[PDB]
Symmetry: C9
Subunit: 181 residues, 9 copies
Amino acid sequence: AAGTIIAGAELTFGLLQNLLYFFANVNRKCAVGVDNESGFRWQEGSTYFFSGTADENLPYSVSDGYAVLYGPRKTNGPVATGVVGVLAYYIPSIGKTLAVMWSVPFDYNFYQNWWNAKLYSGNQRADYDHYVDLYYNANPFKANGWHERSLGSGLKFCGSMSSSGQATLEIHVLKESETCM
Amino acid sequence: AAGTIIAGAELTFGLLQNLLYFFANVNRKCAVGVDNESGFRWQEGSTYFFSGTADENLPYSVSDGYAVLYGPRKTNGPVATGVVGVLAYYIPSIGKTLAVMWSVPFDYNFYQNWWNAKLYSGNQRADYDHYVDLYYNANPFKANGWHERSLGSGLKFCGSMSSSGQATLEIHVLKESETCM
Amino acid sequence: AAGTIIAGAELTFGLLQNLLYFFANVNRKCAVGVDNESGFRWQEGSTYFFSGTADENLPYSVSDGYAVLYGPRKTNGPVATGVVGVLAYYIPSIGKTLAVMWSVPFDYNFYQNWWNAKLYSGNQRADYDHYVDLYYNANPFKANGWHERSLGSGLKFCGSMSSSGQATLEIHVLKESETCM
Amino acid sequence: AAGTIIAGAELTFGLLQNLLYFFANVNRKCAVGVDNESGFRWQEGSTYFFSGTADENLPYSVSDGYAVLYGPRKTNGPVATGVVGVLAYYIPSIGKTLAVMWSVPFDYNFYQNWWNAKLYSGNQRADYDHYVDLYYNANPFKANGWHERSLGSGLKFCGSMSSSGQATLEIHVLKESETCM
Amino acid sequence: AAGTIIAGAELTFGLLQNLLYFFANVNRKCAVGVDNESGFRWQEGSTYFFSGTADENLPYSVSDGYAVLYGPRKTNGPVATGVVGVLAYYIPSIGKTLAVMWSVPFDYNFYQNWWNAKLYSGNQRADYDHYVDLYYNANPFKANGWHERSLGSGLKFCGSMSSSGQATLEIHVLKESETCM
Amino acid sequence: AAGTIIAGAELTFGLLQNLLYFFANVNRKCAVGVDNESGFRWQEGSTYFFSGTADENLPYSVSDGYAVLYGPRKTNGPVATGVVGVLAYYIPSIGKTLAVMWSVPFDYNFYQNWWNAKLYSGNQRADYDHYVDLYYNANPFKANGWHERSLGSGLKFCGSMSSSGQATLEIHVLKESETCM
Amino acid sequence: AAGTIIAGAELTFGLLQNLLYFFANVNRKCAVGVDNESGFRWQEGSTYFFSGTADENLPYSVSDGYAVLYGPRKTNGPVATGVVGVLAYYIPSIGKTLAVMWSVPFDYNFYQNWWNAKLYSGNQRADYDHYVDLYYNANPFKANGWHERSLGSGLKFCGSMSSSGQATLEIHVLKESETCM
Amino acid sequence: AAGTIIAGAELTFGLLQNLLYFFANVNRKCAVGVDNESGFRWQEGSTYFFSGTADENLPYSVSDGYAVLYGPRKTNGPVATGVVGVLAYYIPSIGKTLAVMWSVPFDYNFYQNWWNAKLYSGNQRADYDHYVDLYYNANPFKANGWHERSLGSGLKFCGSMSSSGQATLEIHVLKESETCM
Amino acid sequence: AAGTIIAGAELTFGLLQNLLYFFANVNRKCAVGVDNESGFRWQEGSTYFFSGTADENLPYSVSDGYAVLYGPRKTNGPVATGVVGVLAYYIPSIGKTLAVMWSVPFDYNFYQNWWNAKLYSGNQRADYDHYVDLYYNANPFKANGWHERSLGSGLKFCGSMSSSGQATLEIHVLKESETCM
């Protein structure tokens, strides 16, 4: 009789409210710090997201001795996806664009935190081709403490990423004749 | 018997209260900053909304070196629509009207955040024709970091919009011989 | 049997308490600012409401360089009607009465926010004929940013109204040789 | 069987507790301000209530340049009646008694806020004949902004009342050669 | 069967707890102020209650230019009776006892607030004969603003009582050649 | 069947918890002030209780110009009895013991607040014979404002007790040539 | 059937939780003050409990003009026993041990608060023989205000104990030529 | 039928949650203070636990005139065991290791608080043989106030332990020619 | 019938929510302090986790007289595993990498807290081979107070670990001619 179906509805929507509340209350976050000590002005700050969003703007420019601070997070409500995105700036003193990438996935059973950076030719704002090149075609870093690499064109970077689901990411971008932190 | 229909009512209005509470508790917001460093007085500040509303007034005028701050939001209660609107000012020193447009939709499965600006001939306050011209007939910007364009008549703008469901929007309006932020 | 009717009463009064609580907890509000910079004394401040009420008094008079601040609201409890009303003052230096009108309706499916002002002959306190003349027989303004008009007799006004369900309204009343805000 | 009557009692007293709580939690209030700038001493301050009560005393006297502040309210608990009352003072310099009256009813479907004042012959403390004379036999003012009238004997008053269910009432009592507020 | 009697007990004690809580949570209070400016010392301060009680003591004496402050209240818990009582002092400079009486009843459907005062021969502390003489055999005042009367023996009083269920009472006792407040 | 007996137990222990909570939450309290201005040292402070208890000690002695403050209360938890007790001191300058007694009963349907004091021969600490002599064989005072009596041996007292269920008690003990408070 | 036994379990453990919570939430406490003004050093401070416990240590020594403060309490959780214990110190200037004893029982239907003190020969730390000698074989004091006795060997004490279930205990230990408090 | 087994599960897990919560919310704690005034440096601070744990480190060393403060506690969650452990230091100026032991058991129906200390030959960090030697083969102290003993090698200690389930333990370690606290 | 299966679901998901909440609310934490007083610069700080995560970065470098502070914790939500990981730095003044390891397991029925450190040849960042070499192939320390060992190459360390489930770990790394803390 229909009393079984009504009790089945109370169980069904009782479980569904808790399942949607669980996916809404799992936090994935990133906090990206990119210190410019490269000796060049950076400008035209741009972004892309494969997943997640940021509430604030970038600085339009980053003069010598100042830092980008920028805080992505997961898409809000019951959607089960993480943060994955790109950041970029153009460096008119050297004719190239710095790009930075990170990932902080939702499902850690198949994925892990990653980051990368490159200095591309000309002016090209962050997009899906920069994501696929920084994440698949280049050699990305995993999130386990400090890594250092040349960008070419007289510049290098040294940086690290936390392995946490709420990840801090830090990069110092600097001249090849200088030492980090 | 009628005891089934009464239990069916308890389930029906129990679900409906939670569904209406969900649509009432989803926030879409915008916060629009338009810095005047154009060297001209702006006046006769006007608006239009295709969806959403603002609680405060605009400034009647914006003298050189001052900013519009203006905060649209969704229509309150269970109505499932976002913020979509236009802002305008008349610039008597150059005989044209600056117009600014944004969108922060409710359903992100089909739509995304956008913005635009133009400098139209004569005096024309914000309306549905300015919305359709800024959103369909012109080339609007998507919400991914800084963009810059000429207005004509000796002016340009540089600005950005957040990809979030609670979006910050920032524009600097300035002379074509000058540099942003 | 009567157990069905008793359970039907529990459902009936359970829904009715929530329906009356909803109509009691929907806020319609107005906040009216009328800055006198007209160069004349205003006195005999009077009002009318087609719907809604105000808790405070008007100032009896408004000397040059001072403002009316006055805050109407909906009728309290489960009554489903908005704010609609008139304000007036007599200006003995010019032999006329300034009148101001606004509307902030309950049902936005059929109505919208409006405002108006006029400078009528002689002394006539606010009433239903001033409401119908300001809302139907004159050309009222809708709530979308700044509008400006002559009153005649050497005076003009410039003002705006918010499109919100809790609406701010602002008017500056000034000499025809002067500029707003 | 008797189980129906017991469930009928749970519904009956469940509704009655909410109905009595509603009539106990509906507020009718008045706040009466009577500024003496008449140039005469007032004394022997007295009152009457047709409905409602005040917790504090009047001042025994009001010298020149001071005000009565006095705050009536409805009778407490589930009783469904408003505030209706009279205030009076004797003015020994002119041989007459000032009387003031107000109403703030419970049922607004049939009644509205009113006020009045008069300057009666000799000494007569506030009573039901002063109420009926100020409310029916004289011409009372309704609660819509400022009204002004002569008392005779060299005095006038100017005053206003709020249309709210919690009403502020203000009167200035002054010489016929002087101007209000 | 006995299940009806058990459900009848749940209803019976459910109603009785709320009825006793209602009679325990209805407040009757008095606050009695008796200013001595009579030019004589008062002493041997004494009291009586027909209903209600006070937590503090009286002053043993009241010298010239000082006041009795004394705060009766209803008997605590579910007992449905008000405040009714007498206060007295002996005045050795004139050979008489000042007595003061008040009432603040529980059931306002049959009773109202009253007060009185007298100056009796010799020394006689407050008792049931002073209550019956001040409330029935003398002419008491009702609680509606200021009243004034001679005590005889060179003294008078002027005083008032609030009509509220929590009543303030004020009396000034003074020489027949002087003016109140 | 046994389901009736189980439901009868839920009612029985549901009522009993509320009945024991009521007797535990009815407060009887006393606060005893005995000002020594007798011109003699008091010492060997002692007590007795027929019902109730005090948490603090007495002072061992009371020199001239100092007061006993001492705060009895009912026995804690569901026990339905009040405060009834004796206080005493020895006065070595006059060879006698001051004793003080009070009562603050639980059941006011049969009993009332009382107090007394005496100055007994020799040294005798407070006990049941001092209680019965101060409460039955002597003439005790009831709790209605100030009373005054000689102790003999050059001393008197003047004092009062509140009629409340939480009673303040005050006594000044002084030379027969002096005046109270 | 077994549904009766399950409902019997809900009643059984529902009552048992409240009974254990009652025995856990009944407080028995003591607070022992022993002022040394004996003119001798005290040392080797030791204790015993027949019931109850203390959280802090004693001072190892008490020089002239200083006091032991020490706060026993009942054993925690549902155990229904009070505080009963002994304190001791050795006095090397006179070759004897001061011992102090108190009781604050759980069941006042059969027992009352007691205290005692003695000055025993040689060095002997507090134990069950000191408890039985101070409580049964010596003459203990009951808790009703100040008592005074010689210790022998040039010393005396004067002290008191509160009759409360949370008892303060105070003793001054002093030379036979001196006066207490 | 299976409805009995389901109701039996509700009772079973309802009782089990409360039983595990009880064993998780019973606190056993120790707080160990070991004052070094021995005139020698202590170093290589080491520990062992038969039950319980400490969150902080020991000091690596204790110079003359400083104290170890160290706070063991029971193992967290529903495990029903107390604190039992050893502490040790090496004293290079005398070629020996000080060891200290305590117990604060869970089940007081069979066990009590104990402590001990010794000065062992050579360097040997705290372990199960030090526990068994300090608790069974040596003569330990019970928790009842101050005890004092020689360590040999020119040193002694004096110390005490509280009998409480949250026990303070204090030891002063000092030269044989000196006096405690 | 299906009513049994629905009641079985209420029990099943009622238990499962509490079981997942228990595994989510059991805390395993570590807090690692590594003081550099080795007289050499440390750089290229790197990590590995066999289980658990850290939210913050390491310092890129540790100059002489400064400390690593670094706080691992368990993986968040219902996953039942502890903290187990490695830390490393390169020391360019001596051509070797310092590595540090710890464990703070979830299941204490089979495992205990451990730590270790080594100074490996060349530059090699922390990984699974450093974990297995520090935990199985080398001789690790258990968490019971201070241990000290040579690193070789002129360096040693002295350090300790807490036995708690929230463990503090401290190491001082120093020249072989110097003394700890």
